Amino acid sequence: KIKDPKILGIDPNVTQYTGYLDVEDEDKHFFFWTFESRNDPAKDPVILWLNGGPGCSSLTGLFFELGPSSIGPDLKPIGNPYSWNSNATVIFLDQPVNVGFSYSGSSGVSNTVAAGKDVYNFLELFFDQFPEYVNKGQDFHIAGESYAGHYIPVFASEILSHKDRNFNLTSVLIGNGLTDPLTQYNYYEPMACGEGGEPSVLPSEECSAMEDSLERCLGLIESCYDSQSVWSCVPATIYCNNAQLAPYQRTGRNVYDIRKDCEGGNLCYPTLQDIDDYLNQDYVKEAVGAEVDHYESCNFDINRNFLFAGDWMKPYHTAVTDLLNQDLPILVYAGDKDFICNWLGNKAWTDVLPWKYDEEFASQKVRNWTASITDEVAGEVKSYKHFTYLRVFNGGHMVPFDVPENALSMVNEWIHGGFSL
Ligand SMILES: *[C@H]1O[C@H](CO)[C@@H](O)[C@H](O)[C@H]1NC(C)=O
Ligand SMILES: *[C@H]1O[C@H](CO)[C@@H](O)[C@H](O)[C@H]1NC(C)=O
Ligand SMILES: *[C@H]1O[C@H](CO)[C@@H](O)[C@H](O)[C@H]1NC(C)=O
Structure with missing residues (x-):
């Protein structure tokens, strides 16, 4: 049962659609919130945004770092002056199960492998109902941040595993993620x-x-x-x-931004408080027609189980190589002002991952990159074929939040510009 955001403030013009995709036998209720390109949805690619946690809602990226709408004290929508879907139809899935708005009565999801497993089951049900994003030859990709740096590769295999598939994956974007x-x-x-x-x-x-x-x-x-x-x-x-x-x-100090400070207990980013605020509201909870009673950002339980399962320390970095081996264009980008998933470390993991162009990647020199939009060096490249490592200058754990101009800059250019920076 799905409704349209056609009812909420959010993004007018374009044409948004939201609601649930269900899974009978397993009793799992996926929740999404889509938006059509601000340009041409027909041409414009398709995007899967993924937040981490583990066990954190994706809406958060929506209203907080790269979506169209934003959260004011007023619990009143806001337009993003540099939104992500400016030139592409985006999907805001709430995984895992029991996260944000998704739910279930009895499941699992105490690990990553099995999560992707559900994610692929939803990507095929969604593509089904809105086949309006493939036929046209619409480049589909996936992106995420932090823990999605675990999820992503794993989901990326899962998907490619099916030759059986009802869709095509074109590339992967990973921002300030935990991978190796x-x-x-x-x-x-x-x-x-x-x-x-x-x-x-x-x-x-x-x-x-x-x-x-x-x-x-x-x-x-x-x-x-x-x-x-x-x-x-x-x-x-x-x-x-x-x-x-x-x-x-x-x-x-803030954990997502060495420059900013945040003491233990409270928020480092209070404004997200307003967000959980706007979501739960009576009108806002209506539109979307979500079957949940109370929406939380993250689910302690899920976090706990992942932790108690080994999760966090599994070498999913392995998947990266296969994908590279399967000629898949990958983009590892890092806010340079973040402590929790540094550009220092994401730099290096890249610098050592094995894949066919193994030696060439390590050879290729670092170059200063110019933001598509604003015309200013915005970071540092390392590129080699379909594998690129970029350092986002003046960026925190959530790069889009900090430097919207640059993110999109880095975004479209990768989405469009021919999988290179
Ligand atoms: C996407 O949107 C704008 C606006 O209508 C357009 O000018 C631009 O060329 C588009 N795509 C890119 C990546 O340039
Ligand atoms: C993916 O697009 C459709 C989806 O099922 C399929 O018919 C096509 O063969 C796939 N693309 C290839 C050739 O990589
Ligand atoms: C990056 O470009 C060159 C790198 O060899 C350097 O001279 C310069 O300082 C950098 N660009 C800037 C900061 O304008």
Whole structure:
């Protein structure tokens, strides 16, 4: 049962549609909120936006970083001066199950593999009902941030797994995501210890603490990697997140933006408060016609189960290579002002992933990239065929929120410009 946002404020002109896609036998209720290109939906690609968590709603990217609408105290919509769908029809799915607005009576989803598994089951039901996005030869891609840096590849395989498919995937976008923990994990000390733009935030004492605490942390990532057992992956998580994330947290700096400060407990980004506010409202909860009673951003439970399952420490970075091997154009982009999923570490994981153009990628030199729109160096490229690593200058964990001009700049140009920067 689905309604149109035709009822809510949000994005007028274009033509939005929202609601649910259901799965009988499994009893799973997917929730989405689509928007048609501000230009031509017929030409313009298709996009799957994915937030992390794990267990966080995707609406958040919608009203907070790259959607059309925004949240004012007023709990009144706002137009985005640099929206994502400006030149493309976007999809705002609420995965996993029981996230944001989706739901179920009895499931699972205590891991990634099985999540994609449901995601593909929805991509085929959606494409079905709105076949108006393929036939025309409409390039479809997927994007996400943070934990989606786990999800994405895994979902990307899942999908490509079916030759059976009712659709085509063209590329992947991953922003400030967790992908190859084993490698990204050493980038914790460097980035907080004064080596990645902003300056040292931790007493050198604390720094050496991270450097001792490292060896141990890592052998744990390995064991998880090679074993994939709860017995190793679980302590690898707790231990590493301990030794390396907490010291920064103590300082009470924002975790998504080293420049901004945020003390422990409250929000780092309060405005998202208004968001959970606008969502639950009586009129707003109506339109969408969502069958949920109370909407939360994230679901503690889901988070917990992923954590208690080993999740976070599994080498999903492997999937990346297959996809590259299967000639899939990939884009790894990083806000350079974020601590939780640094550009230092996302840089490096890239710099070492194996794939056919393995040596050439590592050869190719870094170049300064010019924002499509604003005409200003906005980051730093490393490109090689369908695999590109970009460093977004003056960016936090949610790059679109911080630099909208540049994001879209980086966006369309990748969406359009021929899978290169
Ligand atoms: C998308 O939208 C605008 C506006 O009507 C258009 O000028 C632009 O050429 C479009 N696509 C790109 C990537 O240039
Ligand atoms: C994907 O588009 C349609 C979907 O089912 C299919 O007919 C076509 O063969 C696929 N594209 C290829 C050739 O990669
Ligand atoms: C990046 O371009 C060159 C890199 O070799 C450098 O001279 C320059 O400082 C950079 N561009 C800027 C910051 O205008």
